[PDB]
Amino acid sequence: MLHILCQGTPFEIGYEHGSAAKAVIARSIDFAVDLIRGKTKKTDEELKQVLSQLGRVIEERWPKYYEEIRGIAKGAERDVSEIVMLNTRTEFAYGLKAARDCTTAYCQLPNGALQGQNWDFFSATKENLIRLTIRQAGLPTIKFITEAGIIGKVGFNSAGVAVNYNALHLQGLRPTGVPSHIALRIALESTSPSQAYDRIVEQGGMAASAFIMVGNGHEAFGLEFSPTSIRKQVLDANGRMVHTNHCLLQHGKNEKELDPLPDSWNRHQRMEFLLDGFDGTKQAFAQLWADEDNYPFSICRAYEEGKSRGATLFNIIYDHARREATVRLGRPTNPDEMFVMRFDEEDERSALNA
Numbered sequence: 001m002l003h004i005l006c007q008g009t010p011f012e013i014g015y016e017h018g019s020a021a022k023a024v025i026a027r028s029i030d031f032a033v034d035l036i037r038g039k040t041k042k043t044d045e046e047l048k049q050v051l052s053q054l055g056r057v058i059e060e061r062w063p064k065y066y067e068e069i070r071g072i073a074k075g076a077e078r079d080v081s082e083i084v085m086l087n088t089r090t091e092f093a094y095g096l097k098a099a100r101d102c103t104t105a106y107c108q109l110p111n112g113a114l115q116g117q118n119w120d121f122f123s124a125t126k127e128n129l130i131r132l133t134i135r136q137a138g139l140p141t142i143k144f145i146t147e148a149g150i151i152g153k154v155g156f157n158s159a160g161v162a163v164n165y166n167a168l169h170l171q172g173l174r175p176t177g178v179p180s181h182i183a184l185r186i187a188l189e190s191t192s193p194s195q196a197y198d199r200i201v202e203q204g205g206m207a208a209s210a211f212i213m214v215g216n217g218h219e220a221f222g223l224e225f226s227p228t229s230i231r232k233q234v235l236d237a238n239g240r241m242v243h244t245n246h247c248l249l250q251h252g253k254n255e256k257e258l259d260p261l262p263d264s265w266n267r268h269q270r271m272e273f274l275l276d277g278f279d280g281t282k283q284a285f286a287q288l289w290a291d292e293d294n295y296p297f298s299i300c301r302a303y304e305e306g307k308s309r310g311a312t313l314f315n316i317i318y319d320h321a322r323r324e325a326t327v328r329l330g331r332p333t334n335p336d337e338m339f340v341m342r343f344d345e346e347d348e349r350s351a352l353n354a
């Protein structure tokens, strides 16, 4: 998988990403444009203006992230609004559709916690998956898997903070709220899960709906959110946390979950069952993500035309004890690629600002 090392100012960071992933970003934009057009009757000109409005929000509220977005645009030779689109894709898509009309686990264990997910989506995006190592002086070094062009997704940092992301569809949109991928980046720049929690909350409200898990070797929490609800998931009596694509927590009376997939319930029940017979070993933990019960709608999801629109596109396993993330591209039953991410002393020097 394309691996880009980004360092320096926010703009320089964005620029390296944009330059080195130029052709991949073009594919990301193409795919996003197709997806977006499927959700709306609006003309492209109107869509451009909405994106200009969203860009102005990011510029005002998170100038550091906007500067990076500007760098990505410059390096990829694309319009800033196109990159803004990539970084607000879910929110943008949700909003347009309203106008018109993943399996994750954390296990606390004696020889170190284990945390992981499968990311399930349209297969077209798998070829657009890249990884970035981002060094910013005085902040944790981040290593994360993302679709080319997007500044926050799934990964971990030199401080041991590991993040996971699940689609969730509670109703509501706040265009001035924090986009999900910005919140992911905020979590990835934090030195602990507690700080991550604090800094996400600091934003004063989410733009839309998703689920985010943040953990290290000691503690972990999940967040189920809408623009009007932030509910915290904690470890159960077994030191476990499981999440799929539906609300497990009680939200306010006004909250409304929109068309979650039936298999989201099946997969959660399945993973909890699997973790019951789980012996604690890293080998067995890795095998959980290859489960094919209820195929093609399984934990290891398969694309099957006329049944399931997506597949598991990657799996990540955080070995908290060793601060290593094992990544398997494609379906864990037969991965396209497998590699281990780890921080070296240079990554650590940047984090210390030494």
Ligand SMILES: CC1(C)S[C@@H]2[C@H](N)C(=O)N2[C@H]1C(=O)O
Residues within 6 Å of the ligand: 102, 120, 121, 122, 167, 245, 261, 308, 309, 310, 311
């Ligand atoms: C296309 C997807 C793989 S993406 C969404 C969620 N991750 C899930 O499961 N789905 C599938 C769906 O919406 O059919």
